[PDB]
Amino acid sequence: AVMEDVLRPLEQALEDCRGHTRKQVCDDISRRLALLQEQWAGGKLSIPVKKRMALLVQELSSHRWDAADDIHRSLMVDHVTEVSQWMVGVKRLIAEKRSLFS
Numbered sequence: 001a002v003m004e005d006v007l008r009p010l011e012q013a014l015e016d017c018r019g020h021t022r023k024q025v026c027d028d029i030s031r032r033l034a035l036l037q038e039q040w041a042g043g044k045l046s047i048p049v050k051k052r053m054a055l056l057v058q059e060l061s062s063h064r065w066d067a068a069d070d071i072h073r074s075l076m077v078d079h080v081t082e083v084s085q086w087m088v089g090v091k092r093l094i095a096e097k098r099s100l101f102s
Contacts, residue, residue: 003040003052006057007033010090013060013097020095029096034087039085049079056090065098 018026039045046089052075059068072091075083 001047001054003037006050007037007040009057009061010036011095013093017024017093017096017100020100023095025092029089029093036086036089039082044082046079046082047080049075049082060094060097063101065094066086068094 011030014026014029014033040050052071056068056071056075057064059071069091072087072094076087
């Protein structure tokens, strides 16, 4: 589980949404994605959430949106502390991108 394993698929998702979702919210997501990285590399991130973020990220490589939501939800109730700053960003990203499949 390496930082790039979760951030790459994400910023890939964000860019696939750039032209189709409001730029205003795309930027919001980008800024929260930066904290995730900063916070990850900073060493302020616990292993269990790194593990689940990896899982979460694989779920939308498979386009299994609802599974990604449930993992994100699990992370909120168990690790609100270390994700509250950026989690909303990835929640929105899942929604934005599932609507692109639509």
